[PDB]
Design a protein around this ligand. Structure first.
Ligand SMILES: Nc1nc2c(ncn2[C@@H]2O[C@H](COP(=O)(O)OP(=O)(O)NP(=O)(O)O)[C@@H](O)[C@H]2O)c(=O)[nH]1
Ligand SMILES: [Mg+2]
Lengths: 171, 479
C-alpha cells in the first residue's frame, strides 16, 4: 500500500455505475442490480507503475434527492468518472447539470473522464458514437471511452487508463 | 478404589503393547465421569504421566490421541489443580495434535474443546501464541474444511474471541487480508439463528475494527458490516449480550463516514431501541449514547426528535457514580438539543417536563475530579441556557458561579475546561444584575484564566465576551 486515491463515479440514474464498479472490482453481475440507496465504497488494490495503489471507488446515487450528500465527496476525488447510457437521450442531456456540479465542487487536480455504458445495444443506441468526444471538445482533460458492463467490454480499460493518467502527472 | 488408580498409573507409566493401553485410561474416563468422589485429587495423573503417554506413545496414532485429549478435558473440569500445573508441555502438544489430525470432524472437536477450556486461564495463551504453529492458521483451516458442523464453527470463534484480544496491532491488520473476513463472516450466514455463534462472531469483528486501515474495509461494500443490524434485529431482539456487543461495534465503526450509516436508516433506528429497552447495562449506554452523539447531525439533517432525550435523562439519573456514562449521556443530550430546537420546550422543571438541568448541574458538581465530564457538562449547560430566560435565574441563585470558577481554577492547566467554563459563565449572566461583591470575586478569576492560556482563539473570545457583563457606592466602586 504505497498510495491512496479517491476516484468517484457520478451519473444520472439507470446508466449502470454500480455495474461498472462491480465489473472492475469483483466481476459479479446480476441483471436486477438494486439501486444504490446512497454513497458506497468498493475498495480495490491495484499494482501498477511500480507502486501499490489503494483505489477507493465511491459509487454515487444519481437521484435528485441525494444530490446534496454526494456533493460532500467531489473535493477529494483525484479522478471523476461521468456516465450516460446510450439508449436514453435525456440520460446524456443531464450532463450539463453534472458538469455544473463538477465545476462548482471539484478540485484543480481532478481529472474528469466521460464513459458511455451498455455498448452492446449500439444498434439500438439512441445516442451516437461521435457525440462523446464532440461533447468532450470542452476542457482537454475530458476523455471519452465507451464500454459495456454486462459483456465485459473495455471495462478495466476505463479504470486502468484513468489511474495511469492520474499517477503519470503528480510526483 | 484408589489402588485401582495406582494400578492404572503403573500400567500407563510403562508402555509395552500399543493397543492395550487405550483400554486402561478409557476405564479412567468412566472414573472421570463417576462423580462418587474427587478421587483424581492425587495430582499425579493428568499432568506428568498422561502428557508423556499422550504425545509419545501415539503422536500420529486416532487410536489414543482421541481418548487422551478427551480425558484431559474431562479432568480439567473436575480436578482443579491441573489448571495450575498445565503451565507455569500442554501447549506445544496441542498444536501438533491439531496439525497431525487435520482430517477428522470428530477428533478436532475435542481439540478445540480443550482449547476453549484451556484458554480461559491466561499465561497459556501467551505461550501458544509464541510458537512456530501460528494457531490462527490451524483454527481457520479447521473452520474452512468443516462447514455445517455446529461445533467446529463454535468452540472455534469462542477460541478466537479470547485470542484476538491479545495478538497485535499489525497481525490484526494483516488478518483483514481476505481471511478473517471470509471465515468469520460466513459462519454468520450458515448459523444465523444460533445465538452463541453470532455473539462470538460479533465479538471477533468488534476485535479487528481497532485499526484505521480496517474500518474502511469493514464499512466497505465488499464485506458490509451491516450484519450488525440483522443480528440486532432477528437473532437477538431480547438478549443483552448480542445487543451490547453489536452496539459497541457500531460505536467503533463510526469513523469519518457517517452518511453510510445514517442513510441506511436501520443503523440509527435500532441503536435507539437498544438504548431505550436496556437502561441498566452501563456498557450499552457508554457505547450507544456516544454513537448517537456522533451521528446526530446526519440523523437530523435528513417524533424522531423525542427518541434520545428520555433515555439520556434515565442515563443521567441512574448511573450517578460512573464518569463515562455521564460524559457520553450529557454529550448526547447537548448534541440533541443543539440540533433540534423544538424540544427545548420539553425540558424544564415543571410538571411533565424533565428536570434535566438540575441533573446536569449535580452531575458536574459530583464529578469535579475529571476534565471530560466537566467539558461535556459545561457544553450541555451552555445550550440549556442560551435558549431560555428562566434557567438563568435558578443556577444564579443556587451558587453555580463560585462552583464553576473553583472548578476552572482547579483544572488551571487545560484549555478545554477553561474554554467551556468560560462559555458557561458568559451565557449564564447575560441580562442580569451584578451585586458588586459578585464582580469583585469573579473578575480576578477570569483574568487569571485569561493570562494562562495566551494562545487559544476561543479562550479569549469567550473571555472578552464574558468580562463585558461586569464592566458610599463610589467609595466602593473606586476600590
Ligand atoms: N446489457 C447491459 N445491461 C446493463 C449494463 N449496465 C447496466 N445494465 C442494466 O441496467 C440496470 C441499471 O441498474 P444500475 O446498474 O444500478 O444502474 P445505475 O445508474 O448505476 N443505478 P444507481 O446509480 O442508482 O445505483 C442494471 O441493473 C442492468 O440490468 C450493460 O453494460 N449492459
Ligand atoms: Mg446503480
Amino acid at each position: 500500500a504505497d498510495f491512496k486515491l479517491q476516484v468517484i463515479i457520478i451519473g444520472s440514474r439507470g446508466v449502470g455505475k454500480t455495474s461498472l464498479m462491480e465489473r472492475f472490482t469483483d466481476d459479479t453481475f446480476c441483471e436486477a442490480c438494486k439501486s444504490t440507496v446512497g454513497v458506497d465504497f468498493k475498495i480495490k488494490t491495484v499494482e501498477l507503475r511500480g507502486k501499490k495503489i489503494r483505489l477507493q471507488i465511491w459509487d454515487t446515487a444519481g437521484l435528485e434527492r441525494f444530490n446534496s450528500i454526494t456533493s460532500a465527496y467531489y473535493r477529494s476525488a483525484k479522478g471523476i468518472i461521468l456516465v450516460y447510457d446510450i439508449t436514453k437521450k435525456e440520460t446524456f442531456d443531464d450532463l450539463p447539470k453534472w458538469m455544473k456540479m463538477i465545476d462548482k465542487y471539484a478540485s484543480e487536480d481532478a481529472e474528469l473522464l466521460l464513459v458511455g455504458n451498455k455498448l452492446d445495444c449500439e444498434t439500438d443506441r439512441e445516442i451516437t458514437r461521435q457525440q462523446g468526444e464532440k461533447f468532450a471538445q470542452q476542457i482537454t482533460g475530458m476523455r471519452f471511452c465507451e464500454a459495456s458492463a454486462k459483456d465485459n467490454f473495455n471495462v478495466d480499460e476505463i479504470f486502468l487508463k484513468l489511474v495511469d493518467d492520474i499517477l503519470k502527472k503528480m510526483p | 478404589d484408589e489402588e485401582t488408580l495406582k494400578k492404572l498409573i503403573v500400567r500407563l507409566n510403562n508402555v509395552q503393547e500399543g493397543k492395550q493401553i487405550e483400554t486402561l485410561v478409557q476405564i479412567l474416563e468412566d472414573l472421570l465421569v463417576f462423580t462418587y468422589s474427587e478421587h483424581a485429587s492425587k495430582l499425579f495423573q493428568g499432568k506428568n504421566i498422561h502428557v508423556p503417554l499422550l504425545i509419545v506413545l501415539d503422536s500420529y496414532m486416532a487410536s489414543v490421541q482421541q481418548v487422551g485429549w478427551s480425558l484431559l478435558c474431562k479432568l480439567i473440569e473436575v480436578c482443579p489443580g491441573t489448571m495450575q500445573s498445565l503451565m507455569g508441555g500442554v501447549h506445544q502438544l496441542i498444536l501438533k495434535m491439531l496439525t497431525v489430525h487435520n482430517a477428522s470432524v470428530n477428533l478436532s472437536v475435542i481439540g478445540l474443546k480443550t482449547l476453549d477450556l484451556l484458554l480461559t486461564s491466561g499465561k497459556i495463551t501467551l505461550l501458544i501464541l509464541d510458537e512456530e504453529s501460528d494457531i490462527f492458521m490451524l483454527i481457520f483451516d479447521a473452520m474452512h474444511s468443516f462447514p455445517a458442523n455446529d461445533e467446529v464453527q463454535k468452540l472455534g470463534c469462542k477460541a478466537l474471541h479470547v485470542l484476538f484480544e491479545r495478538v497485535s496491532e499489525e497481525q490484526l491488520t494483516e488478518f483483514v487480508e481476505n481471511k478473517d473476513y471470509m471465515i468469520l463472516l460466513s459462519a454468520l450466514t450458515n448459523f444465523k439463528d444460533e445465538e452463541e455463534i453470532v455473539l462470538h462472531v460479533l465479538h471477533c469483528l468488534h476485535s479487528l475494527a481497532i485499526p484505521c486501515n480496517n474500518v474502511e474495509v469493514l464499512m466497505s461494500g465488499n464485506v458490509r458490516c451491516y450484519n450488525i443490524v440483522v443480528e440486532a434485529m432477528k437473532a437477538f431482539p431480547m438478549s443483552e449480550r448480542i445487543q451490547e456487543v453489536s452496539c459497541c461495534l457500531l460505536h467503533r465503526l463510526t469513523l469519518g463516514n457517517f452518511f453510510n450509516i445514517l442513510v441506511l436508516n436501520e443503523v440509527h433506528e435500532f441503536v435507539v431501541k437498544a438504548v431505550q429497552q436496556y437502561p441498566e447495562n452501563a456498557a450499552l449506554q457508554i457505547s450507544a449514547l456516544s454513537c448517537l452523539a456522533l451521528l446526530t447531525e446526519t440523523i437530523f439533517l435528513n417524533e424522531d426528535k423525542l427518541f434520545w432525550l428520555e433515555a439520556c435523562y434515565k442515563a443521567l439519573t441512574w448511573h450517578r457514580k460512573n464518569k463515562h456514562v455521564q460524559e457520553a449521556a450529557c454529550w448526547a443530550l447537548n448534541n440533541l438539543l443543539m440540533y433540534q430546537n423544538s424540544l427545548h420546550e420539553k425540558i424544564g422543571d415543571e410538571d411533565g417536563h424533565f428536570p434535566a438541568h438540575r441533573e446536569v448541574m449535580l452531575s458536574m458538581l459530583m464529578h469535579s475530579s475529571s476534565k471530560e465530564v466537566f467539558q461535556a457538562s459545561a457544553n450541555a449547560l451552555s445550550t440549556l441556557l442560551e435558549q431560555n430566560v428562566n434557567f438563568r435565574k435558578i443556577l444564579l441563585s443556587k451558587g453555580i458561579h463560585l462552583n464553576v470558577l473553583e472548578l476552572m481554577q482547579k483544572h488551571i492547566h487545560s484549555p478545554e475546561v477553561a474554554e467551556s467554563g468560560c462559555k458557561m459563565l458568559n451565557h449564564l449572566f447575560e441580562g442580569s444584575n451584578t451585586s458588586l461583591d459578585i464582580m469583585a470575586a469573579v473578575v480576578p478569576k477570569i483574568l487569571t484564566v485569561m493570562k494562562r492560556h495566551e494562545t487559544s482563539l476561543p479562550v479569549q473570545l469567550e473571555a472578552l465576551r464574558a468580562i463585558l457583563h461586569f464592566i458610599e457606592f463610589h467609595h466602593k466602586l473606586n476600590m
